[PDB]
Amino acid sequence: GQGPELHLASQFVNEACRALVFGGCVEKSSVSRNPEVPFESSAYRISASARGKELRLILSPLPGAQPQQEPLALVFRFGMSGSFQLVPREELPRHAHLRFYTAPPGPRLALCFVDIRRFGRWDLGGKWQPGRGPCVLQEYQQFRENVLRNLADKAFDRPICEALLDQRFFNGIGNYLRAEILYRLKIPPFEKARSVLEALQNPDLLELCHSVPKEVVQLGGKGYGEEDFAAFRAWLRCYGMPGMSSLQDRHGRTIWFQGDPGPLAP
DNA sequence: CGTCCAGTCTAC
DNA sequence: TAGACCTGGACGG
């Protein structure tokens, strides 16, 4: 997932879990190299928030719950294929790598972090990743200022299409988003980032870093629901669209665009 | 059957 | 940085 997917995932967890009580342990799959979640309570609620490309689950025991302990926070990064599902306890999907089980009684459900490729990671501790910039979705003015106020930084030496993936400044922006954002302003992807952003001292390039992902959020769903996917493929104008160019950036990631590749092309 | 394609993280 | 980390779907034979 990118910003939209992480945000929609957070809304999914909060709606799904609003009226559920969890109890017992936090089960990890045998295959997962992420840490055991050292947490057990007779009764806890789960809530989520997203910030950029990270999602924070908070495990909050009910007053009286045993053992007495304080809330525990986990941050997830999804990598290529992470997601959350609320499933029947005895019908876990494949690659359900972390599972929270609803308490005795009630219909026995499991909230599962599902990650086919296992590129996703989780950390004990609620801290956002130090060095990630503010969320392009929920912290727009802070994100905007964090870029224009630090254009001297060497990150802006790189092609704009590469800078847009630097989560220190574009926390939430990933591959389809950079293609879709640049196509809307017909900016060559290998224009120098500083050159494009100097200008901004018309929805402009930093506004699109906010408004474009917000469009994806308003599409809704996307595993949070199959025509959900069709609605997305329809929304796309550039990424993987017939008649568009593609190149490799210097980290081997495919940028989609129309026309002028731009000066710093390989 | 095979090939090729789809975001960190970390060792050097 | 260059390579590591994984599965599954879309292809072509």
Describe what you observe in this structure:
There is one protein chain. The chain has 266 residues and is α+β, with helices and mostly antiparallel strands. The protein folds into 2 domains: 1-132, no CATH class; 133-258, no CATH class. Helix content is 26%, strand content 26%. It is built from 7 helices and 10 strands. The strands form 2 sheets. Strands 5-7-6-1-2-3-4-8 form an 8-stranded antiparallel β-sheet. Strand 6 (96-102) and strand 7 (109-115) form a beta hairpin. It is elongated. The two termini are 27 Å apart. The protein binds a DNA duplex (12 and 13 nucleotides) through residues 2, 33, 53, 77-81, 95, 115-121, 165, 167, 174-175, 250-254. GO terms for molecular function: class I DNA-(apurinic or apyrimidinic site) endonuclease activity; damaged DNA binding; DNA N-glycosylase activity; DNA-(apurinic or apyrimidinic site) endonuclease activity; hydrolase activity, acting on glycosyl bonds; zinc ion binding.
